[PDB]
Amino acid sequence: RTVSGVCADVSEYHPNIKNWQIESYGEPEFHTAKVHLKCAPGQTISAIKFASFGTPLGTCGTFQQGECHSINSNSVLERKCIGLERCVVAISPSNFGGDPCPEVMKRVAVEAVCSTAA
């Protein structure tokens, strides 16, 4: 029962920053941006409309390939999304397969399809 539609827009990020906490806490495990996806209680993700980890053009609503693509930005979604009411994927060069295009900014764009339980 198609009845939903979510899209997350994020951009790689991990500048050398050795200073971000002046309290009794610590968490040196965040050198990249994360994607936040989640549907209402009663619906489940079953398919991915688009997913690219390189230089996607357009915006949330009609993304589109640009020129550089890792030809593998869709195999990581079906493996870490479909089958869960919520989806979360960390963008990093250690979760996809090395680096895609060199000398090219890194922008992440994704789109999930939520409907109902199957």
CSV table of N, CA and C in Angstrom, one decimal:
chain,number,residue,atom,x,y,z
A,1,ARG,N,0.9,-1.2,0.0
A,1,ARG,CA,0.0,0.0,0.0
A,1,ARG,C,0.9,1.3,0.0
A,2,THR,N,1.3,1.7,-1.2
A,2,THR,CA,2.2,2.9,-1.2
A,2,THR,C,1.5,4.1,-0.5
A,3,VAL,N,2.1,4.6,0.6
A,3,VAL,CA,1.5,5.7,1.3
A,3,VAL,C,2.6,6.4,2.1
A,4,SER,N,3.6,6.9,1.4
A,4,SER,CA,4.7,7.6,2.2
A,4,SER,C,5.8,8.0,1.2
A,5,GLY,N,6.9,8.6,1.7
A,5,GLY,CA,8.0,9.1,0.7
A,5,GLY,C,9.0,9.9,1.5
A,6,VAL,N,10.2,9.4,1.7
A,6,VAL,CA,11.2,10.2,2.5
A,6,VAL,C,12.5,10.3,1.7
A,7,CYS,N,13.2,11.4,1.9
A,7,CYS,CA,14.5,11.6,1.2
A,7,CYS,C,15.5,12.3,2.1
A,8,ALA,N,16.7,11.8,2.2
A,8,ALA,CA,17.7,12.4,3.1
A,8,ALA,C,18.8,13.1,2.3
A,9,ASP,N,19.1,14.4,2.6
A,9,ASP,CA,20.2,15.1,1.9
A,9,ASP,C,21.4,15.4,2.8
A,10,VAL,N,22.5,14.8,2.5
A,10,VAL,CA,23.7,15.1,3.4
A,10,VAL,C,24.9,15.3,2.6
A,11,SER,N,26.0,15.8,3.2
A,11,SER,CA,27.2,16.0,2.4
A,11,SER,C,28.4,15.5,3.2
A,12,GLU,N,29.4,14.8,2.6
A,12,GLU,CA,30.5,14.3,3.3
A,12,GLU,C,31.1,15.4,4.2
A,13,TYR,N,31.7,15.0,5.3
A,13,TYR,CA,32.2,16.0,6.3
A,13,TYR,C,33.1,15.3,7.3
A,14,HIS,N,34.3,15.8,7.4
A,14,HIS,CA,35.3,15.2,8.4
A,14,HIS,C,36.6,16.0,8.4
A,15,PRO,N,36.5,17.3,8.5
A,15,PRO,CA,37.7,18.1,8.5
A,15,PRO,C,38.5,17.8,9.8
A,16,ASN,N,39.8,18.0,9.7
A,16,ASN,CA,40.7,17.6,10.9
A,16,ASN,C,40.3,18.6,12.0
A,17,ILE,N,39.5,18.1,13.0
A,17,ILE,CA,39.2,18.9,14.1
A,17,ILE,C,39.6,18.2,15.5
A,18,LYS,N,40.6,18.6,16.1
A,18,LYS,CA,41.0,18.0,17.4
A,18,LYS,C,40.6,18.8,18.5
A,19,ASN,N,39.3,19.0,18.7
A,19,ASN,CA,38.7,19.8,19.8
A,19,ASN,C,37.2,20.0,19.6
A,20,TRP,N,36.5,19.2,20.4
A,20,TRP,CA,35.0,19.3,20.2
A,20,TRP,C,34.3,18.8,21.5
A,21,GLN,N,34.8,19.1,22.6
A,21,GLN,CA,34.1,18.5,23.9
A,21,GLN,C,34.9,18.9,25.1
A,22,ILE,N,34.4,19.8,26.0
A,22,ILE,CA,35.1,20.2,27.2
A,22,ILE,C,34.4,19.7,28.4
A,23,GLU,N,34.0,18.5,28.5
A,23,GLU,CA,33.3,17.9,29.7
A,23,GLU,C,33.9,16.6,30.0
A,24,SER,N,33.2,15.8,30.9
A,24,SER,CA,33.7,14.5,31.3
A,24,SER,C,33.2,13.4,30.3
A,25,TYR,N,32.9,13.8,29.1
A,25,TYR,CA,32.4,12.8,28.1
A,25,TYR,C,33.4,12.7,26.9
A,26,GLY,N,33.2,11.7,26.0
A,26,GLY,CA,34.2,11.6,24.9
A,26,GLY,C,33.6,10.6,23.9
A,27,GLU,N,33.9,10.9,22.6
A,27,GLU,CA,33.3,10.0,21.5
A,27,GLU,C,34.0,10.3,20.2
A,28,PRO,N,35.2,9.8,20.1
A,28,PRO,CA,36.0,10.0,18.9
A,28,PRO,C,35.6,9.0,17.8
A,29,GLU,N,34.3,8.8,17.6
A,29,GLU,CA,33.9,7.9,16.5
A,29,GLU,C,32.9,8.5,15.6
A,30,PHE,N,33.3,9.7,15.1
A,30,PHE,CA,32.3,10.4,14.1
A,30,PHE,C,33.1,11.2,13.1
A,31,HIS,N,33.7,10.6,12.2
A,31,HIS,CA,34.5,11.4,11.2
A,31,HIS,C,33.8,11.4,9.8
A,32,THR,N,32.5,11.6,9.9
A,32,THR,CA,31.7,11.6,8.6
A,32,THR,C,30.2,12.0,9.0
A,33,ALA,N,29.4,12.3,8.0
A,33,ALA,CA,28.0,12.7,8.2
A,33,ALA,C,27.1,11.4,8.2
A,34,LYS,N,26.0,11.4,8.9
A,34,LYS,CA,25.1,10.2,8.9
A,34,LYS,C,23.8,10.6,8.2
A,35,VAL,N,23.1,9.6,7.8
A,35,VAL,CA,21.8,9.8,7.1
A,35,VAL,C,20.7,9.4,8.1
A,36,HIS,N,19.7,10.2,8.2
A,36,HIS,CA,18.5,9.9,9.1
A,36,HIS,C,17.3,9.6,8.3
A,37,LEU,N,16.8,8.4,8.4
A,37,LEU,CA,15.6,8.0,7.6
A,37,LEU,C,14.6,7.2,8.6
A,38,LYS,N,13.3,7.5,8.5
A,38,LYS,CA,12.4,6.8,9.5
A,38,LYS,C,11.0,7.0,9.0
A,39,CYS,N,10.2,6.0,9.0
A,39,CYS,CA,8.7,6.1,8.6
A,39,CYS,C,7.8,6.0,9.9
A,40,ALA,N,6.6,6.3,9.7
A,40,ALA,CA,5.6,6.2,10.9
A,40,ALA,C,5.5,4.8,11.4
A,41,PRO,N,4.9,4.7,12.6
A,41,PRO,CA,4.7,3.3,13.2
A,41,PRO,C,3.6,2.6,12.4
A,42,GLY,N,4.0,1.6,11.7
A,42,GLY,CA,2.9,0.8,10.9
A,42,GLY,C,3.3,0.7,9.5
A,43,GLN,N,4.4,1.3,9.1
A,43,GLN,CA,4.9,1.2,7.7
A,43,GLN,C,6.3,0.6,7.6
A,44,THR,N,6.7,-0.1,6.6
A,44,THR,CA,8.1,-0.6,6.5
A,44,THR,C,8.7,-0.3,5.1
A,45,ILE,N,10.0,-0.1,5.1
A,45,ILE,CA,10.7,0.2,3.8
A,45,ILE,C,10.7,-1.1,2.9
A,46,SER,N,10.5,-1.0,1.7
A,46,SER,CA,10.5,-2.2,0.8
A,46,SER,C,11.3,-2.0,-0.5
A,47,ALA,N,11.7,-0.8,-0.8
A,47,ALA,CA,12.4,-0.5,-2.1
A,47,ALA,C,13.1,0.8,-2.0
A,48,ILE,N,14.2,1.0,-2.8
A,48,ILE,CA,14.9,2.3,-2.9
A,48,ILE,C,14.7,2.9,-4.3
A,49,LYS,N,14.2,4.1,-4.3
A,49,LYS,CA,14.0,4.8,-5.6
A,49,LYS,C,15.3,5.4,-6.2
A,50,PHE,N,16.2,5.8,-5.3
A,50,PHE,CA,17.5,6.3,-5.8
A,50,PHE,C,18.6,6.3,-4.8
A,51,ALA,N,19.8,6.3,-5.1
A,51,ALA,CA,20.9,6.2,-4.1
A,51,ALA,C,22.3,6.4,-4.8
A,52,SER,N,22.9,7.5,-4.6
A,52,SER,CA,24.2,7.8,-5.2
A,52,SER,C,25.2,8.4,-4.3
A,53,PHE,N,26.4,8.0,-4.3
A,53,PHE,CA,27.5,8.6,-3.4
A,53,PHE,C,28.6,9.2,-4.2
A,54,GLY,N,28.3,10.3,-4.8
A,54,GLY,CA,29.3,11.0,-5.7
A,54,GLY,C,28.9,12.5,-5.9
A,55,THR,N,28.4,12.8,-7.1
A,55,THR,CA,27.9,14.2,-7.4
A,55,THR,C,26.6,14.2,-8.0
A,56,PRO,N,25.6,14.0,-7.2
A,56,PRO,CA,24.2,14.0,-7.7
A,56,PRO,C,23.6,15.4,-7.8
A,57,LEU,N,22.9,15.7,-8.9
A,57,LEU,CA,22.4,17.0,-9.1
A,57,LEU,C,20.9,17.1,-8.8
A,58,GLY,N,20.3,18.2,-8.7
A,58,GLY,CA,18.9,18.3,-8.3
A,58,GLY,C,18.7,18.5,-6.8
A,59,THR,N,17.6,18.1,-6.3
A,59,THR,CA,17.4,18.2,-4.8
A,59,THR,C,16.3,17.1,-4.4
A,60,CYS,N,16.0,17.1,-3.1
A,60,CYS,CA,15.1,16.1,-2.6
A,60,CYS,C,13.8,16.2,-3.4
A,61,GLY,N,13.5,15.2,-4.2
A,61,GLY,CA,12.2,15.3,-5.0
A,61,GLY,C,12.5,14.7,-6.4
A,62,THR,N,13.6,14.9,-6.9
A,62,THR,CA,13.9,14.3,-8.3
A,62,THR,C,15.4,14.3,-8.5
A,63,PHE,N,16.2,13.8,-7.6
A,63,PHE,CA,17.6,13.7,-7.7
A,63,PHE,C,18.0,13.1,-9.1
A,64,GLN,N,19.2,13.1,-9.5
A,64,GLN,CA,19.6,12.6,-10.8
A,64,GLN,C,21.2,12.4,-10.9
A,65,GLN,N,21.6,11.4,-11.5
A,65,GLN,CA,23.1,11.2,-11.6
A,65,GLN,C,23.8,12.4,-12.3
A,66,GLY,N,25.0,12.7,-11.9
A,66,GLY,CA,25.7,13.8,-12.5
A,66,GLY,C,26.8,13.4,-13.5
A,67,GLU,N,28.0,13.1,-13.0
A,67,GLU,CA,29.0,12.6,-14.0
A,67,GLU,C,29.9,11.5,-13.3
A,68,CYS,N,30.1,11.6,-12.0
A,68,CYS,CA,30.9,10.6,-11.3
A,68,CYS,C,30.0,9.7,-10.4
A,69,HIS,N,30.1,8.4,-10.5
A,69,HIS,CA,29.3,7.5,-9.6
A,69,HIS,C,30.1,6.3,-9.2
A,70,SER,N,29.9,5.8,-8.0
A,70,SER,CA,30.6,4.6,-7.6
A,70,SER,C,29.9,3.3,-8.1
A,71,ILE,N,28.9,3.4,-8.9
A,71,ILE,CA,28.2,2.2,-9.5
A,71,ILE,C,27.9,1.2,-8.3
A,72,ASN,N,27.8,1.7,-7.1
A,72,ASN,CA,27.6,0.8,-6.0
A,72,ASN,C,26.8,1.6,-4.9
A,73,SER,N,26.2,2.6,-5.2
A,73,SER,CA,25.5,3.4,-4.2
A,73,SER,C,24.1,2.8,-4.0
A,74,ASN,N,23.7,1.7,-4.6
A,74,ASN,CA,22.4,1.1,-4.4
A,74,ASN,C,22.5,-0.3,-3.8
A,75,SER,N,23.7,-0.8,-3.8
A,75,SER,CA,23.9,-2.2,-3.1
A,75,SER,C,24.0,-2.1,-1.6
A,76,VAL,N,24.3,-0.9,-1.2
A,76,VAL,CA,24.5,-0.7,0.3
A,76,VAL,C,23.1,-0.3,0.9
A,77,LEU,N,22.2,0.1,0.1
A,77,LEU,CA,20.9,0.5,0.7
A,77,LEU,C,20.0,-0.8,0.9
A,78,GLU,N,19.8,-1.5,-0.2
A,78,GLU,CA,19.0,-2.7,-0.1
A,78,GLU,C,19.5,-3.7,1.0
A,79,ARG,N,20.8,-3.5,1.4
A,79,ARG,CA,21.4,-4.4,2.4
A,79,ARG,C,21.2,-3.7,3.8
A,80,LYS,N,21.1,-2.4,3.9
A,80,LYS,CA,21.0,-1.7,5.2
A,80,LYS,C,19.7,-0.8,5.2
A,81,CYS,N,18.6,-1.3,4.8
A,81,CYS,CA,17.3,-0.5,4.8
A,81,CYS,C,16.1,-1.3,4.7
A,82,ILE,N,15.8,-1.9,3.6
A,82,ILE,CA,14.6,-2.8,3.4
A,82,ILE,C,14.5,-3.8,4.6
A,83,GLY,N,13.4,-3.9,5.2
A,83,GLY,CA,13.2,-4.9,6.3
A,83,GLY,C,13.3,-4.2,7.7
A,84,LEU,N,13.3,-2.9,7.7
A,84,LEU,CA,13.4,-2.1,9.0
A,84,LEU,C,12.5,-0.9,9.0
A,85,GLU,N,11.8,-0.7,10.0
A,85,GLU,CA,10.9,0.5,10.1
A,85,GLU,C,11.8,1.8,10.0
A,86,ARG,N,13.0,1.7,10.4
A,86,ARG,CA,13.9,2.9,10.3
A,86,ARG,C,15.2,2.5,9.6
A,87,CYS,N,15.8,3.5,8.9
A,87,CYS,CA,17.1,3.2,8.2
A,87,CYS,C,18.2,4.2,8.6
A,88,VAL,N,19.4,3.7,8.7
A,88,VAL,CA,20.5,4.6,9.1
A,88,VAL,C,21.8,4.1,8.4
A,89,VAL,N,22.4,5.0,7.6
A,89,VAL,CA,23.7,4.6,6.9
A,89,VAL,C,24.8,5.6,7.1
A,90,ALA,N,25.9,5.2,7.5
A,90,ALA,CA,27.1,6.2,7.7
A,90,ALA,C,27.8,6.3,6.4
A,91,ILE,N,28.0,7.5,6.0
A,91,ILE,CA,28.8,7.8,4.7
A,91,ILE,C,30.3,7.8,5.0
A,92,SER,N,31.0,6.8,4.5
A,92,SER,CA,32.5,6.8,4.7
A,92,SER,C,33.1,5.9,3.6
A,93,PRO,N,34.4,6.1,3.4
A,93,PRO,CA,35.2,5.3,2.4
A,93,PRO,C,35.5,3.9,2.9
A,94,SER,N,35.0,3.6,4.1
A,94,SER,CA,35.2,2.2,4.6
A,94,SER,C,33.9,1.4,4.7
A,95,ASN,N,32.9,1.9,4.1
A,95,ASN,CA,31.6,1.2,4.1
A,95,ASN,C,31.1,1.0,2.7
A,96,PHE,N,31.7,1.6,1.7
A,96,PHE,CA,31.3,1.4,0.3
A,96,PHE,C,32.3,0.5,-0.5
A,97,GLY,N,33.5,1.0,-0.6
A,97,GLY,CA,34.6,0.2,-1.4
A,97,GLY,C,35.7,1.1,-1.9
A,98,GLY,N,36.4,1.8,-1.0
A,98,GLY,CA,37.5,2.7,-1.4
A,98,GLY,C,36.9,4.0,-1.8
A,99,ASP,N,37.6,4.7,-2.7
A,99,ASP,CA,37.1,6.0,-3.2
A,99,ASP,C,36.6,5.9,-4.7
A,100,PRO,N,35.5,6.6,-4.9
A,100,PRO,CA,34.9,6.6,-6.3
A,100,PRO,C,35.7,7.5,-7.2
A,101,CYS,N,35.3,8.8,-7.3
A,101,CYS,CA,36.0,9.7,-8.2
A,101,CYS,C,36.9,10.6,-7.4
A,102,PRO,N,38.1,10.8,-7.9
A,102,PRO,CA,39.1,11.6,-7.2
A,102,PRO,C,38.9,13.1,-7.6
A,103,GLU,N,39.4,14.0,-6.8
A,103,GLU,CA,39.2,15.5,-7.1
A,103,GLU,C,37.8,15.8,-7.3
A,104,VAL,N,36.9,15.2,-6.6
A,104,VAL,CA,35.4,15.5,-6.8
A,104,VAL,C,34.7,15.6,-5.4
A,105,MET,N,34.2,16.7,-5.1
A,105,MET,CA,33.4,16.8,-3.8
A,105,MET,C,32.6,15.6,-3.5
A,106,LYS,N,32.2,15.3,-2.3
A,106,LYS,CA,31.4,14.1,-2.0
A,106,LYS,C,30.0,14.5,-1.5
A,107,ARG,N,29.0,14.3,-2.3
A,107,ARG,CA,27.6,14.6,-1.8
A,107,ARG,C,26.8,13.3,-1.7
A,108,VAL,N,26.0,13.2,-0.7
A,108,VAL,CA,25.2,11.9,-0.6
A,108,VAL,C,23.7,12.2,-0.7
A,109,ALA,N,23.0,11.5,-1.5
A,109,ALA,CA,21.6,11.7,-1.7
A,109,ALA,C,20.9,10.4,-1.7
A,110,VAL,N,19.8,10.2,-1.0
A,110,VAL,CA,19.1,8.9,-1.0
A,110,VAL,C,17.6,9.1,-0.9
A,111,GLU,N,16.9,8.1,-1.3
A,111,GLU,CA,15.4,8.2,-1.3
A,111,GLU,C,14.8,6.8,-1.0
A,112,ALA,N,14.0,6.7,0.0
A,112,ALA,CA,13.4,5.4,0.4
A,112,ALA,C,11.9,5.3,0.1
A,113,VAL,N,11.4,4.2,-0.2
A,113,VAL,CA,9.9,4.1,-0.4
A,113,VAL,C,9.2,3.3,0.7
A,114,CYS,N,8.4,4.0,1.4
A,114,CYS,CA,7.7,3.4,2.6
A,114,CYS,C,6.2,3.2,2.2
A,115,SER,N,5.7,2.0,2.6
A,115,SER,CA,4.2,1.7,2.3
A,115,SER,C,3.6,1.1,3.5
A,116,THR,N,3.7,-0.2,3.6
A,116,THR,CA,3.1,-1.0,4.7
A,116,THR,C,3.8,-2.3,4.9
A,117,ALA,N,3.3,-3.1,5.8
A,117,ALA,CA,4.0,-4.4,6.1
A,117,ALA,C,3.6,-5.4,4.9
A,118,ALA,N,4.5,-6.3,4.7
A,118,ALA,CA,4.2,-7.3,3.6
A,118,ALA,C,4.3,-8.7,4.1
